[PDB]
Design an enzyme around this catalytic site. Structure first.
Site, PDB file in Angstrom:
ATOM      1  N   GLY A  63     -19.725  33.994   2.699  1.00 32.34           N
ATOM      2  CA  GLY A  63     -18.494  33.799   1.999  1.00 32.34           C
ATOM      3  C   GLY A  63     -17.316  34.053   2.887  1.00 32.34           C
ATOM      4  CG  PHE A  64     -12.556  35.322   2.735  1.00 32.90           C
ATOM      5  CD1 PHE A  64     -12.114  34.396   3.645  1.00 32.90           C
ATOM      6  CD2 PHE A  64     -11.671  36.348   2.311  1.00 32.90           C
ATOM      7  CE1 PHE A  64     -10.810  34.479   4.166  1.00 32.90           C
ATOM      8  CE2 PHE A  64     -10.408  36.452   2.819  1.00 32.90           C
ATOM      9  CZ  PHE A  64      -9.964  35.513   3.769  1.00 32.90           C
TER      10      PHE A  64
END
Ligand code: HEC
Ligand code: HEC
Ligand code: HEC
Ligand code: HEC
Ligand SMILES: [Ca+2]
Ligand SMILES: [Ca+2]
Ligand code: NA
Ligand code: NA
Lengths: 357, 376, 125, 125, 377, 354
Positions: free
Chosen positions: B68-69
């Site tokens: 993800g981020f």
């Protein structure tokens, strides 16, 4: 010898003297004019065959002997998948092990034992000469030798080109001697792109030299009980055909309800279908596969009865990973597959295609 | 000479010719070994990112993991699992945020644990390998939280549960020393020792201040958990080596990576993971080039290697490419990995000589962080 | 390298977009992200659907039917992208159409596209 | 175009990585994704936290405090990426550190990074 | 010649500093949607997340962006009132639980005003075809194609913000809406199917006659002008089928050849992604063509032929001067020809009249493929 | 002229004859030696001031008059935020409109009326001369003119260099004359990167010419009632101070509980703090901002009391977008801020810091 042994098998194959009451020969249930299957009507229609006693019905449909000589002997491969063998549950190892069984089976040809079979072979001077030239003198005097010799003659006969001629349109097309109709070509494309190919093609990848449209594996596709055949067979309302699990030596409950993938060769003329002859029409056999993919209610209804397919005889070990393909065959694709599967008919049975059509 | 694609063409042609059948299936990655290298692509702050698993020996991608981020990758030194702390959002880059830890089987790359982190507590920052860290026992994962105040989260990878947040003073980075303790670096220039019980304010000890206010220690110190060596460059190439094995911080003599002369002609460290540390070899590798004071995140075309004991330059490699990040396999005869964010390519070098052996290109969008297991 | 030129198959490197089996591939060659010519990379899920093409093998002079299959459940690999369209037909002849994500039947309902494999499933007629 | 050379501020084009106010910018210039020098693009959320830098304005020889603020809650713009590090200190001096996603105080708790603005907050020192 | 937008900004920031001019840092609104706004969608070569760029084509300026998930289908309401997309996300990037949804956005603040779940993950995941997700003309319904387990079309009510129903359709593809409750699809057998649908009940499905042989291939990106009901459908050879749906039934227009036979004899063929645009007000067809082998039909092209849609007369052949995958035109007078290069990730903005390149917008994602304009006038 | 005017203002500002009992002048409460705030101990400490009469206490704390002349006249700006004016609730428009109100307030100087104010001006021969030369003959014989002209002199007086000298260390550092101490600079950096600068700086961006560390806006920062001050005020425990909403003609419920951002100039020497003097130390007032950001248990406790801060006097219109910055000020940053704020002390009050 290679010719003579098959030649002896040819004679045994058509000889009803190998049945108790002398009414029945291999050819009776494996009728050469019907791609080696049983055209006779019994208490369950064409689903199951009637033995020599004229009363006993089996619990499974009589399969073609065409191309049975291409099935490997029964084995477990390295991925834990059983493959090959003879009978729907692979309980015979190969053709020769299978051959003696109809002979002694009280539901089929019903000779009481090996000694009664030998005695039959003895009464015929041609056998005494034919057998002796291949197996030695006094072969017919030894029930065990005579019976094994007979099985081997029968196995050799079913390996001749007469049984696996490879002269279907499909073969002709793969030879470049002709072309598929457009429908056939589409059937073929579907067959190879959709889930059929995951079970009905010899190989996972590459090209087979004598394709018989089966990987010889064992799958439970979740077929219901054939109620009328199961009534005719007399095996009981509580009976479960465990498929491969009935093979002596198979104990693994994951094999319950799995059956050998049949060759699709001559599929068009050897109805009714599946191991219990539950479906009469080829297209119904194909439609059955939509029950795992389609969301439409119709996909759950057997078109031949108008009723649900029925609960699987064995609700566990379904090949769901292959069956639930996420894609439904529309009618165009089912027509295409019928047309493609008809190109699988040997030349000599091409005339039988009109009546199925 | 034969490339991997070419050998593959030939083996395939032969299976066809021989009529060999094979089942199309899901491959298992080759067992994790010393030469496996992980490249994390933080993707220039993209909301989803990729980790590449690379066989450093063949220079072959052997698998991949999605994140993800700005996920924090961790790799268990013993090779038994990889994990990351990652951050997703219910609508790409917007909506409900879920921080979680995922633990992966390193051959099937299947997730073996997925552990929600309450109250969105990850520090979202360009990837600093030591902002999330495995305990030596592999049973715990510790992650830094910046907001509302510096804190450290405890994740039990064994019971697969988040435990709690530790309140800490004004400090940064997490260097686990033991199943209940880790060090962080503070703003007042010390290191703080954090020992966490099962409960309570952890007990917090500061070392002595070990660097001036106007001395700047990089975001990517090399830390070798098994050696307990915290290797920490400053902007000028001054390297603080801190021994952390013993449970307390012994400050090792400070060393200089560049010559007092060289820093006069403007040689400075710069890039991302500017420093590698080889445990058994006891060596420091440092990305350097000629640069202005304030170009400290740019790529470097040169690596210097210096004995961790003496500080003697052991080599200077002209890398032949713009390299942002370096690391090394921890086996004997290590590879020196040199990741170019710009080329998106892992250049795999022999660490002894500096010869380019092979490279794997097409490594995402802006790969930055190289991780390797220390298996011996 | 002229993208508009007739595609010329080679049978000598499977990572290249002119490899003979890739004549109608669309996506990434799975060999570049940890799978192989006919296997999926770790962590991904092999589809059972495929689109097909008849690809000429310059090694043997034969045309073979190549039933492509996707490895699904991962973001696109980003390695060795390729798009060839030999024999490729529009979406209404989906058997031969290669913009479709052919992830059907992949385990766990995986439908994201990671890369494609190029197994042979028959000879071409 | 030499990445290691002294940074040369210009006061003539804000979409360029050498614009004077971008002296400690990390990421993307908002002006390239529909914000402006000092405003966020539509759809994003302006953080109240910042890293600052004293940036030298060539044009008047004065030095201004630029308190960078992030426009948050979108995937990174991909446009006009820039990373300068004038005065940039490491993470333990957060006020001057630019790897941090300075999205704190953004509406809706937006924390994903899209682009950065460059407003003047004072004269330096 | 002339001052770039980044130069104009530097100059104006300098003037505000000099004059002590205050201003509040804030969230901009995009300029009102207009005939020269153009959206470029970036499917990002199948990435799990993707971007759409909102562009002022007059200024060549990015004025906004919208994030999407895996192979989203963008739609832009022709009247400018909203844009929307159907999109797919997963709980762990590209795996776990799949959520298909439709998002509607305010076209000025770009904020989502609706987020509508689609049950049972029903989207067709395919390389972006604009006409696989389609707004009805009134903007109240979004129709999305489904392929698995069979061809179907999902109906989504954007006004009540809810998914409504799947419709079962024949073996057909694409969705050209023509009315709040009707659309056309193209069938495998070579006909079009008209699908009329209510809130509940078996849709009313009618087939036109087969309009092309089984051996003539219709491309995946026909141009469809909803406002004109013109379906412009090239074949592989640059033969163009035109179907007029404006009477709510299919009238087959005469075929035109986009390329002459000398050109066809010399290997000119259409090719790219969005090969064809249709300017409604000019009734002109734009087709990306180039010399290419017959099976290189998804490669970029460097020429656009412009032909009068009634006569088939060629009006121009532009040398685009770049590798162009997709074209589209603004629908105002004196239109822009938008020329998107996936390879260059740049929208080249041309004067549709002279073909001259006017300005460009670069850095549009990773593999931008789809250009959408509103037809506002 | 403007000089003479301011000099008359200067006379009036220290003149107790403008109070009922002549015991009190502006300078009594706005003591020049205390940055124009009230040094006198009353019933509620220095939280509030006592009127002329000896027992009347206010409900608000006496603000400094330093830099009050830089505040714009009260107005709503185009983004709809009210700005400027005088008193903590902005109820006066400007200094001029403000000057008169203490003279007439019964709880402050308590003159009955303008004419009693006029009479006192006549008593002083120096005022006849001073006023008449600036406003003309008979100015003092007219209560209206006398009173307005007195308010004008006061306003002029408060606008002189003496009230807003810009000679704090902060000012000297921004002129390049001196540098900040490392801690002051840290505090300045913290002040301008954290939420404080979202309210306590004149402008949103660019450089202010004469910064007074306030944007002149109104904010409810959620302060609790001042216990004793409220008791001392005699306004009763039922009373709610609605801040800006109390300005006549402000009818908008969103403004309830909002108070003018004070100038932070001299903030070090004009304790106690907030509109109601509730916090005695500057540090405490700074810490109050952590109740919005910090998770830690101390966030919640007023350190002057050792107990919960208290519910907001006014629970709505809290400036949450600003106060909830997501970041907590640690000890060091609160130190840095105190150091930075002390640099906002005018030169002549630099001796008041310890
Ligand atoms: C009807 C009474 C039959 C006679 C007479 C014979 N066969 Fe048969 N055959 C019959 C059935 C009902 C079945 C399936 C039974 C099961 O348990 O699966 C079979 C099967 C075979 C097979 C296996 C083919 C395959 O598995 O695909 C072979 C090779 C076979 N039969 C040969 C055979 C021979 C050689 C016979 C005379 C000696 C013979 N059959 C008689 C029905 C009947
Ligand atoms: C493995 C999961 C299979 C897949 C996928 C398909 N088939 Fe199959 N087929 C399979 C088995 C195990 C059997 C025998 C089932 C039993 O217990 O009897 C079958 C049978 C058929 C038949 C009947 C053949 C006969 O009775 O002689 C047909 C006509 C057939 N199968 C066709 C078919 C097609 C067209 C498929 C793709 C739609 C297909 N099968 C998939 C195993 C599997
Ligand atoms: C104690 C009894 C006071 C006397 C005598 C004077 N002032 Fe005052 N001042 C006092 C308080 C308690 C307040 C705030 C009350 C409120 O309602 O908010 C004030 C306020 C001012 C202001 C506004 C300053 C600002 O908002 O920052 C000004 C300009 C002011 N006072 C001036 C002033 C003058 C000129 C006086 C003599 C006439 C005077 N004050 C008397 C406390 C007391
Ligand atoms: C707007 C949301 C503000 C932010 C953010 C900060 N401050 Fe503030 N401050 C504000 C107001 C409206 C007031 C008066 C509140 C009231 O009702 O009385 C204040 C007050 C102070 C004070 C007291 C000044 C005095 O009493 O004369 C100090 C010392 C102060 N504020 C400091 C401060 C700091 C350091 C901040 C960042 C942490 C901060 N404030 C934020 C408005 C707002
Ligand atoms: Ca049968
Ligand atoms: Ca005070
Ligand atoms: Na039956
Ligand atoms: Na058994």
């Amino acid at each position: 010898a290679d010719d003579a042994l098959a030649a002896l098998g040819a004679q045994l194959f058509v000889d009803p003297a190998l049945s108790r009451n002398a009414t029945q020969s291999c050819a009776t249930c494996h009728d050469p004019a019907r791609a080696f299957t049983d055209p006779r009507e019994g208490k369950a229609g064409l689903a199951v065959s009637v033995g020599d006693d004229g009363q006993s019905h089996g619990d499974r449909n009589t399969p073609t002997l065409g191309y049975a000589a291409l099935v490997p002997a029964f084995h477990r491969d390295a991925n834990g998948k059983y493959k090959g063998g003879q009978f729907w549950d692979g309980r015979a190892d190969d053709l020769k092990q299978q051959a003696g069984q109809p002979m002694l089976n009280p539901v089929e040809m019903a000779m009481p034992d090996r000694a009664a079979v030998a005695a039959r072979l003895r009464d015929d001077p041609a056998y005494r000469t034919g057998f002796e030239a291949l197996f030695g003198k006094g072969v017919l005097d030894d029930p065990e030798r005579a019976f094994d010799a007979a099985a081997e003659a029968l196995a050799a006969y079913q390996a001749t080109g007469e049984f696996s001629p490879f002269d279907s349109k499909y073969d002709r097309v793969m030879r470049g001697e002709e072309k598929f109709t457009p429908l056939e070509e589409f059937g073929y494309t579907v067959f190879i792109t959709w889930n059929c190919r995951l079970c009905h093609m010899q190989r996972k990848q590459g090209v087979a030299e004598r394709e018989t449209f089966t990987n010889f594996e064992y799958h439970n596709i979740g077929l219901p009980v054939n109620e009328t055949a199961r009534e005719a067979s007399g095996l009981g309302a509580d009976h479960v055909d465990h498929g491969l699990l009935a093979r002596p030596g198979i104990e693994d409950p994951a094999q319950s309800g799995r059956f050998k993938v049949p060759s699709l060769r001559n599929v068009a003329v050897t109805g009714p279908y599946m191991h219990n002859g539950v479906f009469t029409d080829l297209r119904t056999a194909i439609l059955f596969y939509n029950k795992y993919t389609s969301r439409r209610p119709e996909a759950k209804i057997n078109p031949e009865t108008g009723a649900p397919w029925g609960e699987p005889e064995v609700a566990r070990n379904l090949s769901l990973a292959e069956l639930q393909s996420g894609l439904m065959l529309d009618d165009g694709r089912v027509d295409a597959l019928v047309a493609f599967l008809e190109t699988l008919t040997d030349r000599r049975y091409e005339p039988l295609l009109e009546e199925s059509r | 000479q034969e490339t991997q694609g070419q050998a593959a063409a030939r083996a395939a042609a032969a299976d066809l010719a021989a009529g060999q059948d094979d089942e199309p299936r899901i491959l298992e990655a080759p067992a994790p070994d010393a030469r496996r290298v992980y490249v994390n692509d933080p993707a220039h702050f993209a909301a989803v990112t990729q980790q590449f698993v690379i066989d450093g020996e063949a220079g072959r991608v052997i698998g991949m993991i999605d994140g993800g981020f700005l996920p924090n990758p961790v790799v268990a030194d013993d090779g038994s699992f990889i994990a990351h702390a990652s951050t997703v959002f219910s609508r790409i880059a917007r909506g409900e945020r879920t921080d979680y830890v995922e633990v992966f089987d390193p051959v099937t790359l299947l997730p073996t644990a997925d552990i929600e982190l309450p109250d969105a507590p990850r520090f979202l920052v360009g990837t600093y390998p030591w902002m999330t860290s495995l305990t030596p026992d592999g049973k715990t994962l510790l992650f830094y939280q910046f907001s509302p105040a510096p804190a450290v989260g405890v994740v039990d990878l064994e019971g697969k549960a988040f435990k709690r947040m530790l309140d800490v003073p004004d400090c940064y980075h997490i260097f686990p020393t033991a199943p209940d303790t880790f060090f962080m670096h503070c703003r007042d220039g010390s290191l703080a020792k954090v020992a966490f019980g099962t409960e309570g304010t952890p007990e917090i000890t500061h070392t002595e201040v070990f660097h001036p206010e106007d001395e700047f220690l990089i975001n990517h110190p090399a830390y070798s958990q098994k050696a307990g060596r915290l290797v920490w460059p400053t902007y000028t190439g001054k390297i603080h080596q801190i021994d952390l094995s013993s449970g307390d911080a012994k400050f090792l003599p400070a060393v200089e990576a560049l010559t007092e002369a060289e820093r006069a002609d403007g040689w400075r460290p710069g890039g991302w993971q500017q420093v590698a540390y080889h445990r058994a070899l006891d060596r420091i590798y440092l990305l350097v080039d000629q640069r202005d004071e304030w170009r400290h995140k740019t790529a470097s075309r040169f690596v210097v290697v210096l004995d961790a004991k003496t500080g003697e330059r052991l080599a200077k490699f002209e890398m032949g490419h713009e390299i942002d990040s370096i690391n090394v396999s921890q086996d004997e005869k290590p590879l020196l990995y040199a990741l170019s964010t710009g080329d998106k390519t892992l250049y795999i070098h022999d660490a002894e000589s500096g010869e380019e052996l092979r490279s794997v290109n097409q490594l995402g969008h802006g790969p930055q962080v190289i991780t390797t297991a220390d298996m011996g | 390298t002229d993208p508009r030129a007739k595609w010329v198959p080679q049978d000598n490197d499977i990572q290249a977009c002119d490899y003979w089996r890739h004549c109608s591939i669309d996506g990434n060659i799975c060999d570049c992200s940890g799978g192989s010519l006919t296997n999926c990379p770790p962590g991904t899920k092999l589809a059972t659907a495929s689109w097909v093409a008849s690809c000429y093998n310059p090694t043997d002079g034969q045309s073979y039917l190549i039933a492509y299959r996707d490895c699904c459940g991962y973001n696109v690999s980003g390695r060795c992208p390729c798009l060839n369209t030999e024999g490729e037909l529009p979406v209404y002849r989906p058997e031969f159409a290669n913009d479709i994500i052919w992830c059907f039947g992949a385990e766990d309902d995986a439908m994201t596209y990671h890369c494609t494999i190029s197994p042979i499933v028959g000879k071409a007629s």
